[PDB]
Amino acid sequence: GHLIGDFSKVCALPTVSGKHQDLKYVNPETVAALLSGKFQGLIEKFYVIDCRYPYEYLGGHIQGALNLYSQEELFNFFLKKPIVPLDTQKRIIIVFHCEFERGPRMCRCLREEDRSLNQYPALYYPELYILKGGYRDFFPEYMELCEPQSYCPMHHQDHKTELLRCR
Amino acid sequence: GHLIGDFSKVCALPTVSGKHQDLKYVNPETVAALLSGKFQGLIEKFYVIDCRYPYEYLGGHIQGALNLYSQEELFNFFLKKPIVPLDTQKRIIIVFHCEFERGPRMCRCLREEDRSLNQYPALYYPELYILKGGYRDFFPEYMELCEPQSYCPMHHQDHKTELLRCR
């Protein structure tokens, strides 16, 4: 469990363990590394995809993260016009995340869609990662890398929540 | 995986899944239930054991939780004078937790110590649970059940953190 979706390469990001064994999990440290330009010459483009609802996303997100929370939005961003690297020796990666159900199904969706458009084992996106513990585990460790520097938990019909922050 | 340490009964708390299969995990909802007196006549005594360091504990803990973070402290609290239920038909339970390494080893420690003091399969504490995701997952869902209503992340020598709260 180290080769990318098209079996051509090995994973570029130091992967860790998680709930589903079919998915390739990552940790806050590596996302922090990616953001500071630690992988140039190896990874050309990278996308942090916040699958939460806009209100959660607007209440505090990883700097530069895109708020794609539906299948249609995700297909239109990534598959309508596939992103191709300028330097083919370098890679294009996607890191998905949620708060801490909806998040891994987006990863599965993109992959199922990518497979149906290609002749096996080719993919427009062979490298897909999930941030372990989501925003709830990244925010406390890398606040200065969050925008705004707050955390808006998911709203629950049954129990009240509210925006977490500090000074 | 439902019988208690002495095999005499079944688990009283709705258990869920977690990292280690040998441990019996629980979720914020059930802890919230326990606290409101939802199990009287079934569970006589219960203990929430915060294994974090005092500074983390003082910066926000589950209401009524005890701050036992060392093996010696844990042995002196629970095994020096074992707690026995007034009504033997009712049970005595222990819910351990950390922030989100040190936490499950306390659960293992108490159990190893309890086994060495008894003749198998008897235990002073057959029911031990771990709160899944720790304080990081309970605080956002049940702030009104936290004291103070804040969260103090663990301090890291390498990266800065600070107290999370709201209004």
Curated annotation (Swiss-Prot), chains A, B:
Annotated source species: Homo sapiens (Human)
Location of this chain's protein in the cell: Nucleus
Gene name tied to this protein: CDC25C
Active site: C98
Protein name: M-phase inducer phosphatase 3
Covered range of the whole protein: 280 to 448 of 473
Result after altering E73K: Partial loss of HIV-1 Vpr binding
Chain positions covered by the region annotation HIV-1 Vpr binding site: 55-100
Post-translational modification as stated in the protein's UniProt record: This phosphorylation creates a binding site for 14-3-3 protein and inhibits the phosphatase. Phosphorylated by PLK4. Phosphorylated by PLK1, leading to activate the phosphatase activity. However, such phosphorylation by PLK3 was not confirmed by other groups.
Consequence of changing K80E: No effect on HIV-1 Vpr binding
Record domain Rhodanese: where: 42-147
Family from the record: Belongs to the MPI phosphatase family.
Function: Functions as a dosage-dependent inducer in mitotic control. Tyrosine protein phosphatase required for progression of the cell cycle. When phosphorylated, highly effective in activating G2 cells into prophase. Directly dephosphorylates CDK1 and activates its kinase activity.
